[PDB]
């Protein structure tokens, strides 16, 4: 009855951005201002809809994607963006209808010696299409020389670590991100605000 947004936002561990997480929200009531009115989010930006009145609209589905990225990459989580994350890891469509929420997670996801658990895709042959996901681990080949599964001059494992350390500058600190996709179908509306 109450959308399980708490399990999305309050999860102990978040996914690497290349292996970003998705949860489908359906048949529930969403208390959106339990999220909008909180000063705990350094980013709360909505597209195609207003942050206001969010509790008065209804959608066929709501998808809650979440992942960890660098502080200065949060700007890439928006329609019309380019860069390592927008191009190679998580891509929003030009006509995105939803809200992007992010908060600093240095105290949870950083580690003395660098966190090795959070990764990103550094190389890709083509850009992701909106909401595409690539968890492949084939060695990336630059130039004409084949790699044959070994790194070298022109061959690099495509995933690399943020290595979050607590002393990093904020631009290089980890940020947890939640993307809410509001899906409007010609079908029964199943996710509804309280009013």
């Amino acid at each position, epitope marked *: 009855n109450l959308c399980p947004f708490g399990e999305v936002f309050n999860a102990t561990r978040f996914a690497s951005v290349y292996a970003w997480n998705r949860k489908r929200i359906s048949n529930c009531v969403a208390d959106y201002s339990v999220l909008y009115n909180s000063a705990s989010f350094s980013t709360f930006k909505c597209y195609g809809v207003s942050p206001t009145k969010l509790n008065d609209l209804c959608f066929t589905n709501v998808y809650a994607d979440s992942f960890v990225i660098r502080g200065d990459e949060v700007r890439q989580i928006a329609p019309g963006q380019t860069g390592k994350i927008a191009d190679y890891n998580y891509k929003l469509p030009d006509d995105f209808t939803g809200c992007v929420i992010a908060w600093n997670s240095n*105290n949870l996801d950083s580690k003395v010696g660098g966190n090795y658990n959070y990764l990103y895709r550094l190389f890709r042959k083509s850009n992701l299409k909106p909401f595409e996901r690539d968890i492949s681990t084939e060695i990336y080949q630059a130039g004409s020389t084949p790699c044959n599964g070994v790194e070298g001059f022109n061959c690099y494992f495509p995933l690399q670590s943020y290595g979050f350390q607590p002393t990093n500058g904020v631009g290089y600190q980890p940020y947890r991100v939640v993307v809410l996709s509001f899906e409007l179908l010609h079908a029964p509306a199943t996710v509804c605000g309280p009013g």
Partner: antibody, heavy 115, light 114 residues
């Protein structure tokens, strides 16, 4: 079961260096931070830094950045702390302490060596 | 650097009576990402290392008697001993683990009032 055993007392001349060992037993050595904390006579505590036994990464208090070096020998489950260019106000009891986690700056030091 | 100020420097309490120690941090150690105060309490008896009593301000460590309880948030924290025992005579330190260097309070010596 869980315990930390440090090396014996040391007397040093000013300008020399000291290396202290902290042998850990009774737990997964590589799953927890190790702190070093010192206490000068009649003084309060002074945190020196952290070493992450999983990988050997470290982070020192800026006051000691330059003359402290923390290492770990994972085959023997021993942490080492070396302080160089010793001065008289380095006279103190040095403690090695195991953290409850390996996240951020820890979350409590639940097991302490004898100093 | 964060400065941890403990009040009082020495506290005399009769056995069975209540002991409350204050620790003030020059900067808030409350993180909104998990709503936790990165604040710890330690006990030290003579000739011994520290003993962890409280972490995250209010959570008692395993094996710590129930009479010890921590409270507070942000910058103002308190350690309470409901009924002082003879084995509670010691120095108590607060400690922040929010920013480097991780700094301790000056300590509060709890003694028996007579």
């Amino acid at each position: 079961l869980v315990q930390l055993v440090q090396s014996g007392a040391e007397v040093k001349k000013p300008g020399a260096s000291v290396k202290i060992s902290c042998k850990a037993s009774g737990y997964t050595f590589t799953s927890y931070y190790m702190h070093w904390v010192r206490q000068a006579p009649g003084q309060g505590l002074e945190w020196m830094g952290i070493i992450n036994p999983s990988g050997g990464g470290t982070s020192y208090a800026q006051k000691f950045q330059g003359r402290v070096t923390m290492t770990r020998d994972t085959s023997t489950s021993t942490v080492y702390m070396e302080l160089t260019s010793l001065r008289s106000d380095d006279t103190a009891v040095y403690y090695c302490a195991k953290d409850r986690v390996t996240i951020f700056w820890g979350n409590g030091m639940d097991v302490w060596g004898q100093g | 650097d964060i400065v941890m100020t403990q009040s009082p420097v020495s506290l005399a309490v009769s056995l069975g009576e209540r002991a409350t120690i204050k620790c003030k941090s020059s900067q808030s150690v409350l993180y909104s990402s998990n709503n936790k105060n990165y604040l710890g309490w330690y006990q030290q008896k003579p000739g011994q290392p520290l003993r962890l009593l409280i972490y995250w301000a209010s959570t008692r460590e395993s094996g710590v008697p129930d009479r010890f309880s921590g409270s507070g948030s942000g910058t103002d924290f308190t350690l309470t001993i409901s009924s002082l025992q003879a084995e509670d005579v010691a120095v108590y330190y607060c400690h922040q683990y929010s920013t480097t260097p991780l700094t301790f309070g000056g300590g509060t010596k709890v003694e028996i009032k007579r």
